[PDB]
Amino acid sequence: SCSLNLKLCLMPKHIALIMDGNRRWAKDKGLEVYEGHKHIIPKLKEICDISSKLGIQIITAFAFSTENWKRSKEEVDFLLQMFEEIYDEFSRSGVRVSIIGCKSDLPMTLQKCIALTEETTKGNKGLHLVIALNYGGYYDILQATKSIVNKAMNGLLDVEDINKNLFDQELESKCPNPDLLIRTGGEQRVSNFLLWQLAYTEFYFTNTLFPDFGEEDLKEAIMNFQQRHRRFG
Amino acid sequence: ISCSLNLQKLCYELMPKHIALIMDGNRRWAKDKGLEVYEGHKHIIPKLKEICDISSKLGIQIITAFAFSTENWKRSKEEVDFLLQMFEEIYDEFSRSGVRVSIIGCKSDLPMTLQKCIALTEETTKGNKGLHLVIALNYGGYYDILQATKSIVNKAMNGLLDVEDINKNLFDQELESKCPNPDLLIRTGGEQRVSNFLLWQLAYTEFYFTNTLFPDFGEEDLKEAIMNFQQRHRRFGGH
Ligand SMILES: CC(C)=CCSP(=O)(O)OP(=O)(O)O
Ligand SMILES: CC(C)=CCSP(=O)(O)OP(=O)(O)O
Ligand SMILES: CC(C)=CCSP(=O)(O)OP(=O)(O)O
Ligand SMILES: CC(C)=CCSP(=O)(O)OP(=O)(O)O
Ligand SMILES: [Mg+2]
Ligand SMILES: [Mg+2]
Ligand SMILES: [Mg+2]
């Protein structure tokens, strides 16, 4: 049953992004909380454009977590309505857009915008933006477990077949995994993002709040990443 | 094929109840002091014992320590054999302490002499009422999640559970590192990553990284990490 000693999948190919700090940013400027949230999609679009030029291929971005449901009804409804603007900002861009997470919990207004945004952009050969909306690492690992159990029940596989590669092919976020993770907002934790996929990722935390995160901030993170690899082997 | 996450569990929380520890920086430390390659490794078990003593007094209840990873097998045979022989010291160092000691990881890959020492160390200390030290030896987060998955699959095949039972609590009970999860993770050695340690369990853990190499990590360094932890604001996704 056991055996472990005897492949896992300059510039980082895949960047993961935790877009934290939006509320504090607004509250600082005497603004209402919602003003902060309004910068999310525009900023992300702007970041995709900068990254696309640098040669980055994938960005996975944390927009809403399975724990975010615990916020006030007011705040939640506002965020889930706001995410409709994903269509406007991306539908006519050069970016290919996928969503990961539990779609069925979201308003049908939002469900339709998402499906449409995916359909319209599915052909773009540029940067692939993955938006994690109603997502969690616990959820990802559990839905992969259920899917593997179903396969074993239907005679498709044996317990001896269950390995890293098999499990990887059932997760919503797949190889190649993030080379670098950037978390804005000053906190040093992963908050139930891509738990499996971050096993060997480099972590970069900045105190810069997400709405102030610009090209200069990004280029710094990448510079820091390249210094880590000079002393890594 | 049906998901639902909307109406929902976490195993967290002055003092951190559970500290996870990545012990990095041993070879650099020796090479700096002009000592032998493996001189750094010789500080592991002593330091751990010392850290348990300090932590135990402070009111900490659990320490999980990363001693050997699934990726460490790729080091030289010389270095590997030395480490695996050195882990035999676990019995001497802990057997007569007040500390309860468990090992997580794939025990069957290890030399039988090591397997026996481990089982003995576990048996002797299983009754102690003080601090629980978990030593991750031949462990990885990928391995932990996979062995839990196989166990769940076997049960479903034998009619002992169905797919609608598979949830966070179920999975927690099948993993080798269980609730309560780490409140704080300390990584010595200056690098900022988790290197396939407790992937599932670190979901809401606070991370502290220090440039201090592990052999120089002492009581003052530890109290600093704890002080840093106590400043932090944990929201767990709320406001
Ligand atoms: C809701 C999203 C997209 C990210 C988190 S930003 P937030 O609303 O959690 O803001 P604060 O962390 O409270 O500043
Ligand atoms: C606990 C283990 C596996 C090793 C000791 S730390 P190390 O050997 O990796 O030290 P360096 O990072 O090589 O200085
Ligand atoms: C992870 C543990 C237990 C010790 C260090 S093993 P390593 O020094 O090769 O680790 P990294 O690959 O540098 O993260
Ligand atoms: C970035 C997103 C959308 C979610 C994770 S950040 P959060 O503020 O919900 O997380 P914490 O409460 O700081 O753990
Ligand atoms: Mg936040
Ligand atoms: Mg090292
Ligand atoms: Mg492993």
Domains of chain B in sequence order: 18-236 (3.40.1180.10)
Asked if residues B144 and B176 have their Cβ atoms less than 8 Å apart, the reply is yes
Enclosing H/E stretch for A76: helix A73-82
In angstroms, the CA B125 to CA B128 distance is 6
| Backbone angles phi and psi of A204, in degrees to 5 | -125, 120
The sign of the CA dihedral A176, A167, B196, B79 is negative
Tokens representing A202 are: 């480099």
Centroid of chain to Cα A22: 16
Closest Cα to residue A118, out of A141, A148, A98? A98
Catalytic residues of A: 20
Nearest atom, ligand 1, residue A27 CA:
14
What technique determined this structure?
X-ray
Cβ of B189 below 6 Å from ligand 2: yes
Could you give the CA distance from residue B153 to residue B163 in angstroms, rounded to a whole number?
A: 9
**Nearest residue, CB atoms, B5 vs list A139, A164, A190:** A139
Angstrom distances, CA of residue A24 to CA of A20, A95, A185, A210, B239: 9, 29, 9, 10, 11
Resolution in A: 2.0
Contact yes or no for A149 and B153 at CB 8 A: yes
CA distance B117 to chain A (A): 19
Cβ <8 Å between B106 and A2: yes
Pocket around ligand 4: residues whose beta carbon is below 6 Å from it?
A: A 18-20, 62-65, 68, 187, 189, 191; B 235-237
Q: Which residues contact A200 (CB under 8 A, 6 or more apart)?
A: A8, A177, B193, B195, B196
- Residue in the structure block whose two tokens are 């920086």: B25
Using CA atoms, how far residue A167 sits from A158, B106, B145, in Å, is: 13, 19, 10
Length of chain A: 233
Residue B225 near residue B51 (C-beta atoms within 8 A):
no
The helix (run of H) or strand (run of E) holding residue A62 is strand A58-65
Query: What phi, psi does B237 have (nearest 5°)?
Result: 90, -5
Cβ atoms of residues A202 and A230 within 8 Å: no
Using alpha carbons, select from B177, B210, B175, B160 the residue that is nearest to residue B63.
B177
Distance in Å, CA A105 to ligand 2 centroid? 45
Under DSSP, the state recorded for A127 is: -
Residue A127: phi, psi to the nearest 5?
Answer: -75, 135
A67 vs B109, B208, B237: nearest CB: B237
Q: Which atom of ligand 2 is nearest to the CA of B213?
A: 14
- Do A137 and B200 lie within an 8 Å CB cutoff? yes
Distance B25 CA to ligand 2 centre (A): 5
Closest residue by Cα to residue B65 from B79, B48, B83, B81? B48
Which candidate from A150, A192, A198 shows the least CB-CB separation from B204?
A192
With 0-12 / 13-18 / 19 or more C-beta atoms within 10 angstroms meaning exposed / middle / buried, residue B188 is: buried
Best of B199, B200, B202, B213 to mutate (most A CBs within 10 Å, chain A): B199
Interface test mutation site (partner B, options A8, A149, A171, A230, max chain B beta carbons within 10 A) = A149
Which residue minimizes the CA distance to atom 9 of ligand 3?
A: B72
Cα separation, B73 vs B181, in Å, equals 27
Q: How far is the CA of B140 from the centre of ligand 5 (A)?
A: 29
CA A189 to ligand 5 center in whole angstroms: 11
- The ligand that comes nearest to the alpha carbon of residue B79 is 2
Q: Where are the beta strands (DSSP E) in A140-185?
A: 180-183
Q: How far apart are CA A172 and CA B3, in angstroms?
A: 13
Half-sphere exposure of A15 (CA within 13 A, CB side): 26
> Which residue, by CA, sits nearest to atom 2 of ligand 1?
A63
